[model samples]
Target: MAPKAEVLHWWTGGGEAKALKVLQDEFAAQNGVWLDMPVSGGGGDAAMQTLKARIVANDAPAAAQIKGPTIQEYDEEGVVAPYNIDAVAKKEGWDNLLSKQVASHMKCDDGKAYCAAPVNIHRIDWIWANKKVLDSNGIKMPSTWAEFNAAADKLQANGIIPLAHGSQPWQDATVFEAVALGVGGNDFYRKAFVDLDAATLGGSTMTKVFDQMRKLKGYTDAGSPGRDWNVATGMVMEGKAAFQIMGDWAKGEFAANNMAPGKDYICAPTPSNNGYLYNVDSFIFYKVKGKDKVEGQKLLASLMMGKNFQKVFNIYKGSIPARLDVSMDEFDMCAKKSNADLKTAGSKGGLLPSFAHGMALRLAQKGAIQDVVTEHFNSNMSSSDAAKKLAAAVKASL
Candidate 1:
């Protein structure tokens, strides 16, 4: 009998759904029955809430999108099944094909492979620009704070919104982390986000990060408050806005609109930074009864990490392949850049996990820090004061 699988994920957007179809198609081609349970919301907040309820009731889906330390948390709860991909991993030489950091995250505390299969690496520090807007305004893609500020001013003078940004806490934190990397460089970001260093959190660098965030906040439109990330991407897509600082996922939106990379739009790293902020999308298999369901989990894991699926899904998903060995011949210009940047950053120690994407910190600390960021962004709080408050918030979270 064919294995039946119910996969839960928060990929409800048009582009997201289209990318997800790659996996669905692969599973179906393999004679597996796939039941997709997609939830809306970009941050997965609502979906996770639903997942929690389902788990409590012992009704968890066969597999669900899970990432970061949360995968470990779920595994510790004894609900997640370790993926038995050792044979595949050996055949594919995953030890050489995957980055050390990525390999580490996919393993349990016992140094055994388990729980999740990483899908792709989403670079969170990308800045998307409307090529038409930039050309018409005679503004080049900015690579420094001064240039970014100047371009923003130029866009505003020409009646174009400078930044297309959502006001949600996660969105705000996304921009904040990029600004932290831009203003303070990679070391500061690692110290503040990874290590949660009090001095870095309360220091002048964080103040500058906050100040840059404030500057970015001023550029967003009034309608940005509570707007979805894709809607903000639309602003840039339609030329109503000049730029957007977001992950490579924004490229999916552009692609969905039939926009060509390097022509209709351009994607570059956030100004003044050569680092890569990584947000890995992965899935965890939950414990289930019956051989069919168990087989379904194993099949899903293999398909997700398969080279063909990795290339096809990431090409549409606007992220680079999670497996390092995947070729980039079919990827767009932006993805090519991301692939190159990932390698460069990884080698140069500039690759860092994104706290905004729940990669660096635990959920508790991530939420607390995000609250402080959004509060400052939505309020008239001074950067200095916000820095101090951020320090206290992170310390308290620990």
Candidate 2:
């Protein structure tokens, strides 16, 4: 009988589905039986809700997609089982392979990366643009806030959606935070989002962030509300939209459509190039008993962190390899740029954890921020008003 593994995650559709297939095929080729339990939602909101109910019902899956501060939340509940990745990390010399930014995710009290197997590092401050649309309109990808606005005006004049956006709460927060990155730069971003500093969150700079966000809101198409992230990506792919402010994962959508990076689309840092907003996706195992079968949980984690999987999966998934040692020769142009940006930001204190993706703060605080951001986007509220509300909301969440 093959070793059996049950995995729960939210990587469904487009390049996400394509990436997961590599893992599924590898596990099967190794004679491991995979039991998939995918809960589809871009923000992992539905999946997290399901995971909670399953935990309460005393039926946690073997391995679930978990990352950031939530990993510690599960550990505090004492739900995480001991996976040998801690040993695997050391034995295979992954300590040197992993970057300081991502290696911190699973680091144990004893200083070893324990329990979870990290997949890839996604840079959130990316602007994905339709190359043909920009070329035809005589616009290059924007490098400053002024240039960004000019391009938005140009695209809108031509009856195109200047920015492809999804108005869902998480998606709202995604664009909001990326705008915050461009407007505030990395220092202010760290102070405002990561530290949750009231002074920074409600300050004049935060007001400017909101003001820029309002400009973005207007650039979006009227049909954008309640749209999915990939659907927004599809709009750009089809030339219905000129640009999208999203993570490198949007590259996955473009790649899945056989769209070339520089030719079919343009991938550039969001305006300022002052920050690298990042999120890492990892798998955490939960303690489960009473299954009368062999569990291949550790094998899955081991294979997930292997060189082959890391290289192949990220190529399709659109983020760079979590382990720095992975070869980049086979990767595309966007990936090469992303890998370089991660290093530059890491050294400059600009490698910021993405608050929109649940890496910078806990669930409550992140949600509170998201709600305020969505409100600002939807309503005709003033930027100063939104900035104050954001600060108050963060305080209330704590």
Candidate 3:
């Protein structure tokens, strides 16, 4: 009898859906059955919620595409099952093929791998700009906050919206992380986010980030309030705005509109050479009651690390492959640049964990930070007040 695997995930949009199709087709071709459960629009939040509910109800799926600290949470709760794929991993040279950053995130605390198979690496600190608009305005991509401000000024002077940012809390936090890293530098980033230092978080570095953020508020579209990130990305694609700060996944939106990177648009890690912040997506399996299905789980886990699936999935999903050894000939120049920079940044310790989106802290801690940030970005809150509030909130959460 052929083994059937039920997979739950939130990859509903065109690009993600296409990537899932690749997985489905591959599994079908290998004489395996795939049962897909896809939920749309809530991003990972909805998927996470559903996954939790299913687990609580003792109806966990065979596999799930989940991310972030949830892996640790589930592992702690004993809600996840681990598959021993050491043999498969060695056969495929996953250790050599994958970036250290990717492996570190996928591995669990027990020095044993559990509750998640690395799928793709999504670099969040990026600025996607419309090449035509910049060329027409004689403006170039900025490499620092100061340069970005000047470029924004020039673009605004030419009657263009300098940025295509949305008003969503996550969006605010997303760009805030970019600005935080860009201005605060790596030391500041590590202390503020990873070390969770209150003083460092509220000091001059974060203060500067808040000040810069206020300036950005002026450049965003008037209708940015409640706007989706994809719609905000659309403004840049249509040339209504000069730039948008988002993750590498923004390429999917552009690719859907037939926009080619470097020609129709341009992509770069948030201009500051600050660091490439990594956020990974993976599938973590949970222990089922029978406990006799370890072999099947191992097969699924190994399949995820296979070069063919990594290449096929990431190509459509618009993320850099988890495995570094894969050829980039089929990837666009944008992806190639990101892949190279990610490795260089990793090697140089220029990798900063994303504070806003499950990089440094767990859900509770991240929520506290978001509360202070959203309030500050939403109202006429002063930078000093925002910093103080953030510090206090972080301390309370901790």
- Compute each candidate's TM-score over C-alphas: 0.96, 0.96, 0.91
Q: Residue by residue across 1-398, what tens digits does model 1's lDDT show?
A: 89878998999866788899899998998889998888787777667778888899999889888768877888788777545544455565666767888877776645476557789999999899999999999998998977999999988988889999999988999999988988998899999999999999999999999998888888999998899999999989999898999998899899989999888998889964569999999887887876888778888888989888899999889998998778899999999998888888888878999998878987888889999999999999999999999999999987
Q: Please write out the lDDT profile of model 2 over residues 307-369, one tens digit for every residue.
A: 889999999999988987789899999999988888888888888999888789878888899
The lDDT values for all models are: 0.86, 0.85, 0.77
User: Which residue runs does candidate 1 get wrong by more than 4 Å?
Assistant: 82-93
Report model 3's TM-score to 2 decimal places: 0.91
Better of 1 and 3 by TM-score: 1
Better of 2 and 3 by lDDT: 2
Highest lDDT: which candidate?
Answer: 1
Worst 10-residue lDDT window, candidate 2: 289-298
Candidate 2, overall lDDT?
Answer: 0.85
> By TM-score, highest first, what's the ranking?
1, 2, 3
lDDT of 3 by residue, 278-358 (tens): 777787777764433444556677777778788878877788777766777898888888788877887777787786667
Query: Please, what's the RMSD in Å of model 1?
Result: 1.5
Per-candidate Cα RMSD to the true structure, in Å, reads 1.5, 1.7, 2.4
Least accurate stretch of 10 residues (summed lDDT) in model 3? 288-297
